[PDB]
Design an enzyme around this catalytic site. Sequence first.
Site, PDB file in Angstrom:
ATOM      1  N   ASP A  45       0.823  -1.205   0.000  1.00  0.00           N
ATOM      2  CA  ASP A  45       0.000   0.000   0.000  1.00  0.00           C
ATOM      3  C   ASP A  45       0.860   1.260   0.000  1.00  0.00           C
ATOM      4  N   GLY A  46       2.058   1.197   0.599  1.00  0.00           N
ATOM      5  CA  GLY A  46       2.979   2.323   0.501  1.00  0.00           C
ATOM      6  C   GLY A  46       3.328   2.657  -0.936  1.00  0.00           C
ATOM      7  N   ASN A 122      -5.482   8.284   2.125  1.00  0.00           N
ATOM      8  CA  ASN A 122      -5.725   7.623   3.396  1.00  0.00           C
ATOM      9  C   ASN A 122      -6.159   8.683   4.409  1.00  0.00           C
ATOM     10  N   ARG A 148      -7.062  19.144  23.345  1.00  0.00           N
ATOM     11  CA  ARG A 148      -5.746  19.008  23.939  1.00  0.00           C
ATOM     12  C   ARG A 148      -5.393  17.532  23.942  1.00  0.00           C
ATOM     13  N   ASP A 150      -2.546  14.393  21.873  1.00  0.00           N
ATOM     14  CA  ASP A 150      -1.383  14.155  21.030  1.00  0.00           C
ATOM     15  C   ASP A 150      -1.584  14.654  19.605  1.00  0.00           C
ATOM     16  N   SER A 158     -11.759   5.173   2.342  1.00  0.00           N
ATOM     17  CA  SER A 158     -10.839   4.049   2.195  1.00  0.00           C
ATOM     18  C   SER A 158      -9.702   4.114   3.209  1.00  0.00           C
ATOM     19  N   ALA A 162      -7.162   2.244   7.917  1.00  0.00           N
ATOM     20  CA  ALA A 162      -5.744   2.492   8.155  1.00  0.00           C
ATOM     21  C   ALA A 162      -5.565   3.130   9.541  1.00  0.00           C
ATOM     22  N   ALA A 185      -5.200  10.380  21.857  1.00  0.00           N
ATOM     23  CA  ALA A 185      -4.964  10.557  23.284  1.00  0.00           C
ATOM     24  C   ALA A 185      -5.408  11.937  23.752  1.00  0.00           C
TER      25      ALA A 185
HETATM   26  N1  LIG Z   1       4.778   4.344  11.266  1.00  0.00           N
HETATM   27  C1  LIG Z   1       4.233   3.614  10.109  1.00  0.00           C
HETATM   28  C2  LIG Z   1       3.214   2.584  10.540  1.00  0.00           C
HETATM   29  N2  LIG Z   1       2.295   2.306   9.445  1.00  0.00           N
HETATM   30  C3  LIG Z   1       2.335   1.156   8.729  1.00  0.00           C
HETATM   31  O1  LIG Z   1       3.009   0.182   9.064  1.00  0.00           O
HETATM   32  N3  LIG Z   1       1.546   1.142   7.637  1.00  0.00           N
HETATM   33  C4  LIG Z   1       1.490   0.003   6.747  1.00  0.00           C
HETATM   34  C5  LIG Z   1       0.366  -0.977   7.021  1.00  0.00           C
HETATM   35  O2  LIG Z   1      -0.908  -0.292   6.857  1.00  0.00           O
HETATM   36  C6  LIG Z   1      -1.610  -0.923   5.802  1.00  0.00           C
HETATM   37  N4  LIG Z   1      -2.513   0.017   5.164  1.00  0.00           N
HETATM   38  C7  LIG Z   1      -2.230   1.179   4.460  1.00  0.00           C
HETATM   39  C8  LIG Z   1      -0.911   1.681   4.319  1.00  0.00           C
HETATM   40  C9  LIG Z   1       0.119   2.244   4.115  1.00  0.00           C
HETATM   41  C10 LIG Z   1       1.474   2.805   3.965  1.00  0.00           C
HETATM   42  N5  LIG Z   1       1.987   3.474   5.166  1.00  0.00           N
HETATM   43  C11 LIG Z   1       3.448   3.439   5.232  1.00  0.00           C
HETATM   44  C12 LIG Z   1       4.212   4.008   4.057  1.00  0.00           C
HETATM   45  O3  LIG Z   1       3.504   4.681   3.182  1.00  0.00           O
HETATM   46  O4  LIG Z   1       5.412   3.836   3.935  1.00  0.00           O
HETATM   47  C13 LIG Z   1       1.429   4.814   5.414  1.00  0.00           C
HETATM   48  C14 LIG Z   1       0.135   4.684   6.189  1.00  0.00           C
HETATM   49  O5  LIG Z   1       0.397   4.073   7.467  1.00  0.00           O
HETATM   50  C15 LIG Z   1      -0.733   4.369   8.281  1.00  0.00           C
HETATM   51  N6  LIG Z   1      -0.325   4.431   9.664  1.00  0.00           N
HETATM   52  C16 LIG Z   1       0.554   5.293  10.271  1.00  0.00           C
HETATM   53  N7  LIG Z   1       0.624   5.153  11.574  1.00  0.00           N
HETATM   54  C17 LIG Z   1      -0.270   4.123  11.842  1.00  0.00           C
HETATM   55  C18 LIG Z   1      -0.687   3.509  13.039  1.00  0.00           C
HETATM   56  N8  LIG Z   1      -0.190   3.810  14.251  1.00  0.00           N
HETATM   57  N9  LIG Z   1      -1.625   2.544  12.952  1.00  0.00           N
HETATM   58  C19 LIG Z   1      -2.083   2.193  11.749  1.00  0.00           C
HETATM   59  N10 LIG Z   1      -1.765   2.687  10.558  1.00  0.00           N
HETATM   60  C20 LIG Z   1      -0.851   3.664  10.672  1.00  0.00           C
HETATM   61  C21 LIG Z   1      -1.392   5.646   7.745  1.00  0.00           C
HETATM   62  O6  LIG Z   1      -2.717   5.311   7.333  1.00  0.00           O
HETATM   63  C22 LIG Z   1      -0.490   6.024   6.561  1.00  0.00           C
HETATM   64  O7  LIG Z   1      -1.277   6.511   5.492  1.00  0.00           O
HETATM   65  N11 LIG Z   1      -3.307   1.767   3.977  1.00  0.00           N
HETATM   66  C23 LIG Z   1      -4.349   0.959   4.408  1.00  0.00           C
HETATM   67  C24 LIG Z   1      -5.744   1.066   4.261  1.00  0.00           C
HETATM   68  N12 LIG Z   1      -6.354   2.100   3.669  1.00  0.00           N
HETATM   69  N13 LIG Z   1      -6.504   0.093   4.801  1.00  0.00           N
HETATM   70  C25 LIG Z   1      -5.910  -0.896   5.467  1.00  0.00           C
HETATM   71  N14 LIG Z   1      -4.609  -1.097   5.681  1.00  0.00           N
HETATM   72  C26 LIG Z   1      -3.877  -0.125   5.127  1.00  0.00           C
HETATM   73  C27 LIG Z   1      -0.534  -1.545   4.919  1.00  0.00           C
HETATM   74  O8  LIG Z   1      -1.040  -2.538   4.040  1.00  0.00           O
HETATM   75  C28 LIG Z   1       0.345  -2.124   6.015  1.00  0.00           C
HETATM   76  O9  LIG Z   1      -0.177  -3.342   6.543  1.00  0.00           O
HETATM   77  N1  LIG Z   2       1.582  17.720  25.566  1.00  0.00           N
HETATM   78  C1  LIG Z   2       1.314  17.967  26.993  1.00  0.00           C
HETATM   79  C2  LIG Z   2      -0.091  17.556  27.368  1.00  0.00           C
HETATM   80  N2  LIG Z   2      -0.155  17.249  28.790  1.00  0.00           N
HETATM   81  C3  LIG Z   2      -0.749  18.070  29.691  1.00  0.00           C
HETATM   82  O1  LIG Z   2      -1.446  19.030  29.363  1.00  0.00           O
HETATM   83  N3  LIG Z   2      -0.553  17.731  30.980  1.00  0.00           N
HETATM   84  C4  LIG Z   2      -1.094  18.515  32.068  1.00  0.00           C
HETATM   85  C5  LIG Z   2      -2.427  18.035  32.611  1.00  0.00           C
HETATM   86  O2  LIG Z   2      -2.262  16.690  33.144  1.00  0.00           O
HETATM   87  C6  LIG Z   2      -2.552  16.731  34.529  1.00  0.00           C
HETATM   88  N4  LIG Z   2      -1.829  15.684  35.227  1.00  0.00           N
HETATM   89  C7  LIG Z   2      -0.462  15.503  35.382  1.00  0.00           C
HETATM   90  C8  LIG Z   2       0.492  16.352  34.767  1.00  0.00           C
HETATM   91  C9  LIG Z   2       1.419  16.954  34.320  1.00  0.00           C
HETATM   92  C10 LIG Z   2       2.438  17.804  33.680  1.00  0.00           C
HETATM   93  N5  LIG Z   2       2.624  17.551  32.248  1.00  0.00           N
HETATM   94  C11 LIG Z   2       3.100  18.738  31.537  1.00  0.00           C
HETATM   95  C12 LIG Z   2       4.376  19.381  32.034  1.00  0.00           C
HETATM   96  O3  LIG Z   2       5.061  18.694  32.917  1.00  0.00           O
HETATM   97  O4  LIG Z   2       4.731  20.477  31.638  1.00  0.00           O
HETATM   98  C13 LIG Z   2       3.395  16.338  31.928  1.00  0.00           C
HETATM   99  C14 LIG Z   2       2.465  15.144  31.894  1.00  0.00           C
HETATM  100  O5  LIG Z   2       1.483  15.328  30.854  1.00  0.00           O
HETATM  101  C15 LIG Z   2       0.940  14.038  30.596  1.00  0.00           C
HETATM  102  N6  LIG Z   2       0.512  13.962  29.221  1.00  0.00           N
HETATM  103  C16 LIG Z   2       1.258  14.067  28.073  1.00  0.00           C
HETATM  104  N7  LIG Z   2       0.578  13.845  26.973  1.00  0.00           N
HETATM  105  C17 LIG Z   2      -0.707  13.579  27.430  1.00  0.00           C
HETATM  106  C18 LIG Z   2      -1.902  13.234  26.769  1.00  0.00           C
HETATM  107  N8  LIG Z   2      -2.027  13.155  25.434  1.00  0.00           N
HETATM  108  N9  LIG Z   2      -2.990  12.995  27.530  1.00  0.00           N
HETATM  109  C19 LIG Z   2      -2.896  13.130  28.854  1.00  0.00           C
HETATM  110  N10 LIG Z   2      -1.837  13.454  29.587  1.00  0.00           N
HETATM  111  C20 LIG Z   2      -0.762  13.661  28.811  1.00  0.00           C
HETATM  112  C21 LIG Z   2       1.980  12.987  31.006  1.00  0.00           C
HETATM  113  O6  LIG Z   2       1.410  12.195  32.048  1.00  0.00           O
HETATM  114  C22 LIG Z   2       3.155  13.844  31.500  1.00  0.00           C
HETATM  115  O7  LIG Z   2       3.748  13.241  32.634  1.00  0.00           O
HETATM  116  N11 LIG Z   2      -0.160  14.455  36.123  1.00  0.00           N
HETATM  117  C23 LIG Z   2      -1.393  13.910  36.448  1.00  0.00           C
HETATM  118  C24 LIG Z   2      -1.750  12.761  37.178  1.00  0.00           C
HETATM  119  N12 LIG Z   2      -0.864  11.891  37.679  1.00  0.00           N
HETATM  120  N13 LIG Z   2      -3.063  12.501  37.328  1.00  0.00           N
HETATM  121  C25 LIG Z   2      -3.952  13.316  36.759  1.00  0.00           C
HETATM  122  N14 LIG Z   2      -3.737  14.418  36.041  1.00  0.00           N
HETATM  123  C26 LIG Z   2      -2.428  14.660  35.917  1.00  0.00           C
HETATM  124  C27 LIG Z   2      -2.262  18.166  34.958  1.00  0.00           C
HETATM  125  O8  LIG Z   2      -2.855  18.506  36.202  1.00  0.00           O
HETATM  126  C28 LIG Z   2      -2.909  18.883  33.785  1.00  0.00           C
HETATM  127  O9  LIG Z   2      -4.329  18.946  33.903  1.00  0.00           O
END
Ligand SMILES: NCCNC(=O)NC[C@H]1O[C@@H](n2c(C#CCN(CC(=O)O)C[C@H]3O[C@@H](n4cnc5c(N)ncnc54)[C@H](O)[C@@H]3O)nc3c(N)ncnc32)[C@H](O)[C@@H]1O
Ligand SMILES: NCCNC(=O)NC[C@H]1O[C@@H](n2c(C#CCN(CC(=O)O)C[C@H]3O[C@@H](n4cnc5c(N)ncnc54)[C@H](O)[C@@H]3O)nc3c(N)ncnc32)[C@H](O)[C@@H]1O
Lengths: 264, 264, 264, 264
Positions: A45-46, A122, A148, A150, A158, A162, A185
């Site tokens: 697919d790539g 995709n 807020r 990731d 289609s 993916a 997340a």
């Molecule tokens: N860090 C890379 C991790 N991703 C993979 O291992 N991708 C390959 C796997 O996915 C299948 N796939 C595709 C594709 C494709 C080609 N990709 C690599 C390249 O182009 O080099 C790019 C796509 O990756 C997907 N990708 C990214 N991160 C995640 C993730 N965390 N989880 C799941 N997919 C993820 C996004 O969709 C991108 O658009 N397209 C489809 C489709 N439409 N339907 C079913 N399977 C499909 C394909 O048959 C193979 O088995």
């Molecule tokens: N891209 C940053 C996005 N993350 C945030 O906005 N974090 C702050 C929020 O989380 C609460 N929190 C913490 C913490 C803390 C301080 N963090 C920022 C800094 O240090 O500057 C670092 C932590 O972030 C968490 N982080 C990262 N990415 C995600 C994500 N996608 N989703 C959820 N959390 C995520 C990881 O845990 C790191 O260890 N600790 C706790 C705790 N133990 N229990 C409950 N709430 C808590 C805190 O009261 C506030 O409301």
Amino acid sequence: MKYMITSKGDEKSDLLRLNMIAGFGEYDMEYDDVEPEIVISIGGDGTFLSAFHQYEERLDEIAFIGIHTGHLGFYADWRPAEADKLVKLLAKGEYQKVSYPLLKTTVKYGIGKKEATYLALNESTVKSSGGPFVVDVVINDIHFERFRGDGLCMSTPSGTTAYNKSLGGALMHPSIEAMQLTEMASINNRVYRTIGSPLVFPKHHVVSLQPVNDKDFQISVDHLSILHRDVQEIRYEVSAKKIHFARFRSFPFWRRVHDSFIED
Amino acid sequence: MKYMITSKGDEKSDLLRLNMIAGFGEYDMEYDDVEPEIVISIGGDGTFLSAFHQYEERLDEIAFIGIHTGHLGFYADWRPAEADKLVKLLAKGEYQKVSYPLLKTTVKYGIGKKEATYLALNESTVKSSGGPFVVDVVINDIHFERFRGDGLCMSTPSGTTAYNKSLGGALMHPSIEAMQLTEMASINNRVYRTIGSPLVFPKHHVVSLQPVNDKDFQISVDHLSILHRDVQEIRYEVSAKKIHFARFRSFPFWRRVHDSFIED
Amino acid sequence: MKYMITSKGDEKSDLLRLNMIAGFGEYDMEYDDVEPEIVISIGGDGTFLSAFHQYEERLDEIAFIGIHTGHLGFYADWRPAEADKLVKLLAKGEYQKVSYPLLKTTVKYGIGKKEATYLALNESTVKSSGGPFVVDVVINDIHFERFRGDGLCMSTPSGTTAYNKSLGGALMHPSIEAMQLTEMASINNRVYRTIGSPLVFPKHHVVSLQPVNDKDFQISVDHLSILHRDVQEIRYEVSAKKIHFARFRSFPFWRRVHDSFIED
Amino acid sequence: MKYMITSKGDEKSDLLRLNMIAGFGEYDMEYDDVEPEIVISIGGDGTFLSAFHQYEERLDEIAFIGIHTGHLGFYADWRPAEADKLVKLLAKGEYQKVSYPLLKTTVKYGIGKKEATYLALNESTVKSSGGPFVVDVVINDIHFERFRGDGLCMSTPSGTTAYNKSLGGALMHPSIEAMQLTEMASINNRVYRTIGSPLVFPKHHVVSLQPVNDKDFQISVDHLSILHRDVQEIRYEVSAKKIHFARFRSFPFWRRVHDSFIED
Ligand SMILES: NCCNC(=O)NC[C@H]1O[C@@H](n2c(C#CCN(CC(=O)O)C[C@H]3O[C@@H](n4cnc5c(N)ncnc54)[C@H](O)[C@@H]3O)nc3c(N)ncnc32)[C@H](O)[C@@H]1O
Ligand SMILES: NCCNC(=O)NC[C@H]1O[C@@H](n2c(C#CCN(CC(=O)O)C[C@H]3O[C@@H](n4cnc5c(N)ncnc54)[C@H](O)[C@@H]3O)nc3c(N)ncnc32)[C@H](O)[C@@H]1O
Ligand SMILES: NCCNC(=O)NC[C@H]1O[C@@H](n2c(C#CCN(CC(=O)O)C[C@H]3O[C@@H](n4cnc5c(N)ncnc54)[C@H](O)[C@@H]3O)nc3c(N)ncnc32)[C@H](O)[C@@H]1O
Ligand SMILES: NCCNC(=O)NC[C@H]1O[C@@H](n2c(C#CCN(CC(=O)O)C[C@H]3O[C@@H](n4cnc5c(N)ncnc54)[C@H](O)[C@@H]3O)nc3c(N)ncnc32)[C@H](O)[C@@H]1O
């Protein structure tokens, strides 16, 4: 007709490509990689996604076909063992075209409000350039949520099998002209709230992501990831453009899903 | 025009109903609960769903309006404080109609293959009648998976914010003519495999559930749950019928979602 | 006793810090930020995490207290309005100590097999340095799965309400000496399989991540993210070290969870 | 020693049982199904669970062994082909005992506050007796949330790979003395809020479910489902009792998980 073949570039795909070129030489088929009418992708697919992007300016003039040389190939309709049957079927014009929807991504910048646009087969994803990701999600000019977390993923139908699937999205039949937004997340507590659920948007709805603090983002479009600085807006909508596949036999989407995820 | 009003039946809803009937008496509005053209529901979404089912044989002749007397009311466009404004707007004919898709459920039985059909505004669910739930899921005659688990839910677009959402489904804009199948606690191990992901089907796709051992099922259609014995098939498809709403001002679906789940 | 106070550094936290230093000056309390026995953090959980890391070599000699100057502060037991009551209670020695478990992360490298170790109060995460993330997950020397996806998160009990929660992990009471591994967007199809579910490990279990192709990873430990090149192994285990809190009144973990996620 | 053998009751399990009884007759082994010291289950996990419940009053005097005659058997350590090796090993006393934690469920009633208690090896679940399920969740006397939805599941560690896993719970190593509460389809909107996440409780924590309106519930304990009327409280805690397994070779929990869910 005019055709070209892209290859993953391993020995198996390169040799299959050369043998297919040889077979096409026995028909009124001209190899032309500037203005092909048929684009054949041999690989995974790539490889198929790269073929799509190579020809994304001539999508209304091209029908795509994928051959998978590994165990995968969602966009693939053919196994390497069938390449000679495919050469024959294609050389006789015995196929129908099926179209899938595409996603348009527009990135607007600062000084001058200039724009870059991208087409995705995709999905298009957004993450921060390091540090916290926070965007306002605006749907048809309605402020819907402050996200807020990731990152966010916007998928085509289609693409729903993916990255979208790994993020908990719904799998959507590609006859539906729609795009699907999934969360990566999200943080949810008493102060921060997102919808959580995937969202499915029809054609003509516009989803805009608007920066809150940091204006730098890593934006992916299919395999391609690019750092965008000084972003004012990222805008998603279902494209008016479609990708066209050459189909020679029935291979329903839901059977394709079954074969890729349930068993084959 | 001919109208009727259903009430949840608590004091607040009953009194609002009587006051609205009084206000309508000042216009050319005839109360008629046999052939209404406007059906007003005063209560919650349960009251609205009951109103829908009361008139499901005249859906092409009726426009529905909901007033919510609690904190809820996804199908509600009006607060009780606005009932007098609504009486006036409705009595002057100042409204547009918006339609949402509906789900058709067909249950086929044993001796005679007789059929019952049901229309759903939110969803139709299937569970076992006690003991293990196992069905084959067949999509357009393609055997797609054998589902083992607690049950399955098939949602309309407007139902996607209801049971479907709690089951991890996508929220789908109701301009999309589709239905969405979600799983309830599927078993997945080395021997038993389901897709896991919600599935979104377009109009004209048919999803059939076929018993494997036990033939007795508890089938819900919106609030109504019924034990069906000796089932041969349960068939889901997007209905040709639609529900029509009387709309007097803009209240976009995504704003409705925001107000119900993000904050109001 | 010897104490110090860290501040988020906005006006509100800086002024509260100066007023607390003034109040402590009325007791036998010595400000000492080299060998404090009490570390007070004024700010948010980020400030608290930074305080923890500032003193991670003297964890058995320190009791931590957090004051939250925003709406948040999971590690916070005090509101700014109560700082004078806290000064008094602390100056009289009227507190018990409660300990939470910590996570040890070991990163092993190439030429020389040298090691870096880190302690985490919330979690340690691993992602690729750009390009695909693929690791073998080895549990007590048992090859458990090959993970393909965006990354992995290993949480402490008190971290389970942080990133772990957003990834679908369980919330675990911190009296349980354990660590919890959650997935970030794993790929699952007929060829690629992961467990999906979060995994909870007791003390003395070792979880090793082993590279498959690329050896470069972005590894986070609480807020700190570091690019590690030429990685041979990332090893996770429950630390023998614990963080100690000074507690002056009951504030149960589950009430803390309720207050942070349900309502306050 | 005194032993007994339970069988699933199909031809394969019945014949294996008779052949094992014959082999035991060549040693100092007495068949005794009133006071066995060894209980052998031949069948699947259902058979094993039934064996556990048959002897739940003598758990401190019994070691259990499971043989799986299908493709499954999480509680099984032996394949039928190895039954003769097992007869020999058991007859020589060459085994260690491993213990897993159990869940205690107490159901309190109305007029008289009488109580029923149950022990679970996998889990105990609660649903409504028809109509809406609403309970207050009280943790160590702290009102934690009001749950609205389909039901709740409280799992033991070894049960975490069963219903708990299908509900999104964490898989927990059985050396951890804990129980895990998972939700079934909770409703979450602006008015109704639950934690969503699975919760893991240590020994000595008590989780009480308290009715809000309806007092009738369907309560399951492993396979057994019972309608309880006039319920005042359902109380969950980690039991003081443990189940003991006879182990003859290493078969680590995480390898068991790998073999059941990743591949074998
Ligand atoms: N860090 C890379 C991790 N991703 C993979 O291992 N991708 C390959 C796997 O996915 C299948 N796939 C595709 C594709 C494709 C080609 N990709 C690599 C390249 O182009 O080099 C790019 C796509 O990756 C997907 N990708 C990214 N991160 C995640 C993730 N965390 N989880 C799941 N997919 C993820 C996004 O969709 C991108 O658009 N397209 C489809 C489709 N439409 N339907 C079913 N399977 C499909 C394909 O048959 C193979 O088995
Ligand atoms: N891209 C940053 C996005 N993350 C945030 O906005 N974090 C702050 C929020 O989380 C609460 N929190 C913490 C913490 C803390 C301080 N963090 C920022 C800094 O240090 O500057 C670092 C932590 O972030 C968490 N982080 C990262 N990415 C995600 C994500 N996608 N989703 C959820 N959390 C995520 C990881 O845990 C790191 O260890 N600790 C706790 C705790 N133990 N229990 C409950 N709430 C808590 C805190 O009261 C506030 O409301
Ligand atoms: N409507 C029945 C649907 N349930 C099944 O087909 N269960 C059998 C499958 O589960 C495996 N299993 C067991 C067990 C067992 C025996 N059960 C049947 C009987 O006793 O007759 C009772 C248990 O079912 C689980 N159950 C109920 N509803 C669901 C659901 N929706 N999803 C997932 N499980 C569900 C609960 O846990 C009950 O305590 N125990 C384990 C274990 N500890 N670890 C791994 N696999 C295990 C077993 O090897 C087999 O493959
Ligand atoms: N054991 C009953 C538990 N269900 C509820 O408390 N339902 C009421 C809540 O749902 C909101 N709602 C409705 C509706 C409605 C009326 N229902 C009761 C009655 O008719 O008496 C029937 C619907 O219940 C849903 N139901 C069932 N079980 C669950 C579950 N476990 N989780 C989530 N919903 C569940 C199904 O959808 C039924 O079709 N419709 C919508 C809508 N389209 N969009 C947003 N909110 C909506 C409504 O504003 C209120 O806040």
